[PDB]
Design a protein around this ligand. Structure first.
Ligand SMILES: Oc1cccc(O)c1
Ligand SMILES: Oc1cccc(O)c1
Ligand SMILES: Oc1cccc(O)c1
Ligand SMILES: [Cl-]
Ligand SMILES: [Zn+2]
Ligand SMILES: [Zn+2]
Ligand SMILES: [Zn+2]
Ligand SMILES: [Zn+2]
Lengths: 53, 53, 53, 53, 53, 53
């Protein structure tokens, strides 16, 4: 429950680490919401698992 | 395997940049994938763009 | 036409990738405009070529 | 020694992510420390969490 | 006397480089002030030495 | 050559930090340049400052 400034490429780095061997997808049009949330608010590593392949 | 892991972190940041709005699916997985090509030799931004959506 | 949060050192990383073997220059006083633009608005990779050596 | 130095830069970013509000003390120092473990083999986020506060 | 957008993990990367072999600590609750200052204002590398071990 | 490429990405981020308002010209090019010195051995922030404007 602290903002982590997961803005821009930081979110892709976070997904890279969270998702491991599965990989992930990064689709700006479909992920406008989580992009904003992780940058200016808080988003959990558990929530980010939703973007693993 | 650590060097490949670290190389992948740089790759996903580069894809974030070059793919822009299109985004990308990251599959280190992929047969003949981006890690095989671009952690073995330097990929230009034109070569990295092949992996975008 | 999507902001990429190319703030702070991200802009230097972008120039590094765009400019390749030419290298680039980063001069905060002279580049106040593009620094602001790439961070809070949109700036193209083609525009960034203006700061390659 | 440069590879270990660069690996450490990635480690501290990963710890920033996984440790969240708890934070961490970074001691490359430490006997049986994080660089010995995680620059030799890939550490998952669960292994990295062992180094958090 | 120019802001360097040392936000989020950038501050931990800065501490990593500044502190060298000493290492550093990153404690969000205790360091709310310098976290804000380095992200939205200016903070010197000399000031950051206060968070080396 | 990939390791040198990745090392360079870290170097330009470190120069962004240490050079501050002065900025820098990045020439991987340069005879006896920063990649030869600092991707072979670890450069402190004082050694990196030699490459600033
Ligand atoms: O920009 C990059 C990053 C990582 C590997 C590579 O070949 C190119
Ligand atoms: O996420 C990371 C970063 C660096 C080394 C490692 O094993 C894992
Ligand atoms: O801070 C750095 C980054 C890359 C190489 C080096 O010697 C030092
Ligand atoms: Cl690296
Ligand atoms: Zn980074
Ligand atoms: Zn930022
Ligand atoms: Zn950033
Ligand atoms: Zn690296």
């Amino acid at each position: 429950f602290v903002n982590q400034h997961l803005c821009g490429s930081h979110l892709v780095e976070a997904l890279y680490l969270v998702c491991g061997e599965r990989g992930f997808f990064y689709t700006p049009k479909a992920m406008k919401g989580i992009v904003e949330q992780c940058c200016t608010s808080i988003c959990s590593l558990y929530q980010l698992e939703n973007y693993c392949n």
